[PDB]
Ligand binder design. Structure first.
Ligand SMILES: COC(=O)[C@H](C)[C@@H]1N=C(c2ccc(Cl)cc2)c2cc(OC)ccc2-n2c(C)nnc21
Ligand code: NI
Length: 110
């Protein structure tokens, strides 16, 4: 459980690492809707999430189990799949980052 959360922290660090930066970078910080001209973003996405928030929650010991952590990471991807047309580049980047997440998350210590 402590062990499971360390696995989660390792994943998080990987998702933030240089190795994945080419597709992970849109997920590094909260969506700035005004900056992007996306004035409908917060009407469509009721629960924003991003990797810096996941990181803060982990550093603050907010996550009590792996399932809670996974739910936030997956929310982040779902927000992207909900807001953007499925043929947009940002969606391809999300799918690639999600593949990295899901395959390593699956190796949960038990
Ligand atoms: C106008 O609509 C947008 O730009 C989306 C809201 C936005 N697209 C993008 C986006 C659009 C095109 C490319 Cl190639 C990459 C990211 C986006 C860009 C960012 O730059 C700091 C941060 C977040 C996003 N992002 C995420 C995550 N989900 N949607 C987006
Ligand atoms: Ni889940």
């Amino acid at each position: 459980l402590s062990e499971q959360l360390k696995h989660c922290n390792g994943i998080l660090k990987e998702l933030l690492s240089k190795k994945h930066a080419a597709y992970a970078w849109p997920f590094y910080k909260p969506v700035d809707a005004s900056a992007l001209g996306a004035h409908d973003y917060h009407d469509i996405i009721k629960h924003p999430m991003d990797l810096s928030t996941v990181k803060r929650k982990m550093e603050n010991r907010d996550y009590r189990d792996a399932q809670e952590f996974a739910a936030d990471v997956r929310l982040m991807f779902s927000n992207c799949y909900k807001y953007n047309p499925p043929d947009h580049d940002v969606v391809a980047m999300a799918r690639k980052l999600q593949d990295v997440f899901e395959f390593r998350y699956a190796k949960m210590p038990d």
